[PDB]
Amino acid sequence: DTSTQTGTDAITQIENGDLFDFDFEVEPILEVLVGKVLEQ
Amino acid sequence: GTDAITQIENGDLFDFDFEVEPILEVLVGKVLEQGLMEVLEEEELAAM
Amino acid sequence: KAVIKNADMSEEMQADAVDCATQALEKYNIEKDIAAYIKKEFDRKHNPTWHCIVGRNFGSYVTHETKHFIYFYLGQVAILLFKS
Amino acid sequence: KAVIKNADMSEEMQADAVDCATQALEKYNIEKDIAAYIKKEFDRKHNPTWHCIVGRNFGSYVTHETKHFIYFYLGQVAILLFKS
Amino acid sequence: KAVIKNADMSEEMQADAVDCATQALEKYNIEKDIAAYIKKEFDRKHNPTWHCIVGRNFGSYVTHETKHFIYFYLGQVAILLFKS
Amino acid sequence: KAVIKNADMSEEMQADAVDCATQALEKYNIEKDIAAYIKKEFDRKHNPTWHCIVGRNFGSYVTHETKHFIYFYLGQVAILLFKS
Amino acid sequence: KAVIKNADMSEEMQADAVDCATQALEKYNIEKDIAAYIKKEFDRKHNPTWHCIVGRNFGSYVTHETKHFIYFYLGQVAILLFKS
Amino acid sequence: KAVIKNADMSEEMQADAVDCATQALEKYNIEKDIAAYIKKEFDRKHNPTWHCIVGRNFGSYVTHETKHFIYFYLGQVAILLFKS
Amino acid sequence: KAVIKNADMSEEMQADAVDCATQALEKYNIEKDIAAYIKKEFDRKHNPTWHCIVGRNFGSYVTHETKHFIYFYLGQVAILLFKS
Amino acid sequence: KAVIKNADMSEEMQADAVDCATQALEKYNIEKDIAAYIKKEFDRKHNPTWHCIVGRNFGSYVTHETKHFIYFYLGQVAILLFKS
Amino acid sequence: LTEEQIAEFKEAFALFDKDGDGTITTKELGTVMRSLGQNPTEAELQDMISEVDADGNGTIDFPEFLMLMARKMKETDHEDELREAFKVFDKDGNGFISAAELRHVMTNLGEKLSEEEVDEMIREADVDGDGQVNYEEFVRMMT
Amino acid sequence: EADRKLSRETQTVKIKQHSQQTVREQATQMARPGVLLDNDYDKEVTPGRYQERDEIVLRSTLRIQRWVRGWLGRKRAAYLRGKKMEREAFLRDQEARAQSEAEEHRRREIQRRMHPRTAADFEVLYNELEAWRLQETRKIKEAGLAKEQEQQVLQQLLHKETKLLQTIDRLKINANQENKEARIQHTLNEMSKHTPFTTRAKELQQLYNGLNLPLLTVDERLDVLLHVKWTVKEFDCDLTRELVDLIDREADLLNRGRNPKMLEGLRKRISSLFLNFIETPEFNPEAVRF
Amino acid sequence: QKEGPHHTVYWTTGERYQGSWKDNKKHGKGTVIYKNSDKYEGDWANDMRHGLGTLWLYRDGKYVVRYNGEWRADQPTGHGTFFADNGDTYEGEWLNGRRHGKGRAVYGGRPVDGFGGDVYEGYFENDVKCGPGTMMYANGDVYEGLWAADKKNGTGTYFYMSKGKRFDGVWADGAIKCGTYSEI
């Protein structure tokens, strides 16, 4: 009956010889080769 | 309407291969190198 | 300010409906609760039964009972009220 | 496919109603048109008492008799059909 | 190798779910991709108003209609699917 | 201590949920216990139909009542609370 | 121990970082064990999410958020830390 | 040639990353610089979140947003391109 | 057998009225004529004046003159009889 | 709607009584109360005493006196009213 | 101009001819071009305008309007170029597109749309705010 | 006595779906000769071209902006067309209704011209005729001729005038009769708008419209005459005598059998005497109205 | 002629009139009692008019004053007051009954008190009002607008003084059909 409606990029790199101390590592190679040569 | 609590538990959905891959890989490389090292050492000992 | 876009109600009853709708909008948030409040009010004041339907977007055709069928827009929503 | 949100009505009559409603939606495309079409179809089909409302955002609490209440979804629209 | 951990559902629908889960694991790998595909399929195939969680570690407390609730360790992916 | 991963919800409802969830966390630590606590609390506070998903490893795809949806990591357990 | 070449973080989190870095470098050989220990411990204490690159030959460009950034040498390894 | 150490992206995204890396390799001779160049080019090129690491020795455990990651080697240099 | 629900009358005059009504019903079919006989005899018999009703359905609330107010039932049809 | 079957009084008093009866039907429903109220209002306005009978089904003779004895309907509630 | 095009242009021009004098203001020239079914850019519009109102009267007559119309009419994009354009904002060729990326590009690149235009677009297209847009239907509505 | 039982309520509202995601991790292990070793479940790839997509998307945005401008113009045009067609319907239908009302007034004037029911309509006709006479004589005078046939033209004109005036008189008689009948019906109506006297008046109105009835028969006619005679026989003074007399004359001369077409004046006299019976205070307890 | 303030003029049951008499009837200040069991005292004028007049069927008539006001052509035809027993009190300028004139009809008993059923202020047209007026319902509410024998579809203003609102609109053949409720 009714109806309705309605943050900046940063670049870091590692450089040679920083972390690597050449002397403390090349010591044993020298020791070894010389021991070999001597004893042998 | 009905309240159910479901929780995934422990010791379930377990695989085996992927759990052993890392230890396998590390041990294989390690053992290879260690075997080689011991070979060298024993050679030198044999010389002595 | 407010509107009534259609009505079948005796003036004082219509003013009562309006004041009831105001006090409902004041004391309610959910819709079905406001509808229940208004319908309970009118049914208890104007001789049951009633029915109320409250919404925001809905098209309506019904077969009401004479002088018991009002449609009005307040605040957000539109409210339809008609007695069985 | 129409979902029945709520109903107190015998199954065959509910299928009748959903069928007639989908037909009405095929025929007319104004809310109140759908409402009146279904209302008349239902009244002719079963009994004189009827009340069909169609919408999208309507929450309504209405006293209803037994076996004569259905609230169901047609696509996006929501239909409420009862006996007056 | 399905192990239905906990479900309130008809047996046939459970078997259908296991099948659907099989082709689900066939089609996608992402968890939520699987769940969305599954929910679309179970809205099409089964009754509507579902909620899906195809997870690894979770604890939920949901309220569902009767005989529509499922949690199964399909493969070794625990899939939970239920109806509102 | 709650990174809101994704939430459509009023700030006040978020805070009330957070308070009741703090009481839940002080009560329990297991995810299923957390979900039970949370859903019981929001059943007591609001309309019982609610849905909470708590866990360490889960991704959902859910149907939530509008303006009721929150997902935040509260410590190590993540809680997603919405009302059905 | 953490020799912080470039750091953006607080004192306590830095101190825990240095202790964990010292223990990982002294006790463990491979990178990923240290990385996972660090990540879990800094989720546990520092903040729940983190991103790190530890290596010996690694170059990276990062947009860290303040109060979370590190770029430091330990022993002979480069450790890059940022939250995200 | 190319080895994909880690991936969490679509095949197309990984192919785009490899192509991007080879394009980068003709511009930047410093590895942090390559990372910066790639990060800019994928920032405008892709979804704004990204992270890039390039090198010959690194191993990680990052909680990264799902579906966006690649980590692959060209020649002897690895390029990692991802979204947080 | 006349039963007298409401009584303000001399049990002697009550019995009088019952027997009168019996005679009238014996001597009438039309309740206007039952009234006729009853009234005339109960005036001559029962010390005029009087007043009578004989009906199936009516309710009354009357203030009478002391000691002359009777409301009784002849079988199925009720009868009131009293004085000014 | 209402027809005065028998009028034995002034049309002024008849209008009076009609309005009185409208008020009566307003105030009460049980015919006993309605008659009570009408009779009170009338023995006030119209010189005690009168008697009021109301019902759907009766029939009677009365040897009434002038300016009394109205007999009308309202809807179908027949109302007789006369002063002893 | 053919009889049909002349009629169409008279119809639209009179719709926009605020006072019927037989000319239209330069301000609504774009509307007319758009109103006639052409989707020209703001650059071409500004060029045509510049390339036509030297007199400074700030009006356009039917003859010049017909010349501009025939010119612009010669270069009309097809439906596929548009589909492709939509898919360009559809990262993975799935037929959907994040709403945030769409809004960001629409309001940040090219001939930056206004906030009103983006809001109207989202509203008028009945697209689900927290969904994936089946750009094929949105495009059909917009085609 | 009865009461209601229960009710129901459903708050129809929007319900959308939103997605939430979780962090996914990957590991990369650099491969070097030594302790490091690894199972191969990997893939190889060729780079291909890399993106310069920015200029493509910029051109795409320009194109889409052109497209959106055309579409927005089209939608504004559609709304303008809708309002245009609305206003055109407005104007056309308003003018059509105006034309319809004008035609109705025209037809009303033509009906006035056919029969002048109103007294004013008769005054209008009279003044119109006199204007006609004056215009005729003005033309005849400005003719300025026929000093011996002017009078014959005048006689013809006067005969026309006389004929028209007699027609006007006839129409006036007819209108007076019909106005009389109408006002009688109006009085009968005033005798209808539930007092017992008023109920009897409604009954008598039914009776009078039964007396003035055509398409009679004989059994129904005799029956209704019997009904009306029974009704009349309550007051029974002297008019009822002659009304019944004429009714009985007809009743007899109908029992014997005579063509009802020959019963015209008698039906008229019966109806007149019954209306006169009705037009009486005691005989119709309402005649105080007039 | 029958005139002069005669002691009485006697007919069979007649007219019981005392007062200035001429033309064989009441003319001047005098009271006429007639067959409607009622006596009214007024400055009579052939009953073609009447000055101030009080009409009252008293004690036998059982009433105090039936009408008080001036009369013109034995219709009050001006300011007149009618008092029903408890029904109403009509005070207004009415000619030939309450057929025209602007006046107040208190449609309620107990009129001196606020308990009165209902007041009225405005224009009358044949009992009905048919005009723009205003009525305070005796609960605070007032109505200001157009009337057409009631049920008039006219813009009116109703004042909820208790609430503090006012409703302006169209009483479309009924108490309410549409309008705007606002806060004055």
From Swiss-Prot, chains C, D, E, F, G, H, I, J:
According to the lineage, what is the superkingdom?
A: Eukaryota
Q: Does the keyword Ion transport apply?
A: no
Kindly give the InterPro entries that the UniProt entry links to this protein: DLC_sf (IPR037177), Dynein_light_1/2_CS (IPR019763), Dynein_light_chain_typ-1/2 (IPR001372)
Where would one find the signal peptide in this protein?
A: none
- Cellular localization per UniProt: Cytoplasm, Cytoskeleton, Flagellum axoneme
> Keywords for this entry?
Cell projection, Cilium, Cytoplasm, Cytoskeleton, Dynein, Flagellum, Microtubule, Motor protein
List, alphabetically, the Pfam families matched: Dynein_light
Q: Which GO terms describe its biological process?
A: microtubule-based process; motile cilium assembly
Answer whether the UniProt record assigns the keyword Cytoplasm to this protein: yes
Output a single Gene Ontology CC term carried by this record.
motile cilium
Tell me, how does this one assemble?
Answer: Consists of at least 3 heavy chains (alpha, beta and gamma), 2 intermediate chains and 8 light chains.
Family recorded in the similarity comment: Belongs to the dynein light chain family.
The protein's name: Dynein 8 kDa light chain, flagellar outer arm
In which organism is this protein found? Chlamydomonas reinhardtii (Chlamydomonas smithii)
